[PDB]
Amino acid sequence: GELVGIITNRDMRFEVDQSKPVSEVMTKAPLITAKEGVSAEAALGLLRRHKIEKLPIVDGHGKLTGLITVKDF
Amino acid sequence: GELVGIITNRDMRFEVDQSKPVSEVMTKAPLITAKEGVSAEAALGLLRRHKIEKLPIVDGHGKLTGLITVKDF
Numbered sequence: 241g242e243l244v245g246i247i248t249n250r251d252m253r254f255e256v257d258q259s260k261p262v263s264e265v266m267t268k269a270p271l272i273t274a275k276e277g278v279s280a281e282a283a284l285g286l287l288r289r290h291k292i293e294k295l296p297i298v299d300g301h302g303k304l305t306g307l308i309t310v311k312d313f
Numbered sequence: 314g315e316l317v318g319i320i321t322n323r324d325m326r327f328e329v330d331q332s333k334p335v336s337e338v339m340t341k342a343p344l345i346t347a348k349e350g351v352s353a354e355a356a357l358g359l360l361r362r363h364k365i366e367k368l369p370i371v372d373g374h375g376k377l378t379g380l381i382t383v384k385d386f
């Protein structure tokens with residue numbers, strides 16, 4: 241149940257072999273994340289600083305709880 | 314006249330201040346470039362390897378001579 245990476249459209253658009261496993265293509269941990277209870281301003285600041293469209297939200301143990309996107313804002 | 318960087322939509326979409334100079338927002342050199350006379354297959358291989366959409370083409374002296382894009386293929 242541990243968050244070991246994230247795979248988005250950019251990674252997959254440049255790959256031709258569709259049979260390849262996700263572990264070979266994904267952006268591996270550590271990721272840019274935030275804790276549960278992160279404010280909207282802080283989340284958008286983290287998104288804009290690291291020039292990424294997605295921000296996973298994790299609990300105290302690091303297991304994934306949610307996801308915040310720039311598209312929603 | 315030296316190629317010192319590149320500034321694309323990903324760099325400009327995450328900057329809130331429009332009065333900032335290019336030098337602060339651009340991706341700085343060294344960039345991913347190819348020589349003059351590079352084949353189409355090599356250019357597409359570089360583009361898909363480095364997960365970028367733009368490939369400057371330079372001469373022997375490093376001057377900017379052209380640009381190849383994935384959108385063209």
Ligand SMILES: Nc1ncnc2c1ncn2[C@@H]1O[C@H](COP(=O)(O)OP(=O)(O)OP(=O)(O)O)[C@@H](O)[C@H]1O
Nearest residue numbers: 246247248249250251267271272292293294295296
């Ligand atoms: N929270 C994150 N931490 C680390 N890397 C991330 C994170 N979110 C996305 N990435 C990586 O950033 C890169 C850019 O993907 P991003 O999610 O910003 O756009 P996209 O939706 O894939 O592409 P498009 O520009 O076509 O909309 C990808 O390689 C992705 O794996």
Ligand SMILES: Nc1ncnc2c1ncn2[C@@H]1O[C@H](COP(=O)(O)OP(=O)(O)OP(=O)(O)O)[C@@H](O)[C@H]1O
Nearest residue numbers: 319320321322323324340344345365366367368369
């Ligand atoms: N040839 C290159 N060498 C190095 N970095 C590059 C190069 N081309 C673009 N970049 C950088 O990589 C990121 C993505 O640029 P790219 O040109 O691939 O897409 P984009 O047109 O900005 O994105 P989108 O179409 O998703 O809005 C940007 O931060 C940009 O500055």
Ligand SMILES: [Mg+2]
Nearest residue numbers: 248249250293
């Ligand atoms: Mg996207």
Ligand SMILES: [Mg+2]
Nearest residue numbers: 249250293311
């Ligand atoms: Mg997008």
Ligand SMILES: [Mg+2]
Nearest residue numbers: 321322323366
């Ligand atoms: Mg573009």
Ligand SMILES: [Mg+2]
Nearest residue numbers: 322366383384
């Ligand atoms: Mg694009």
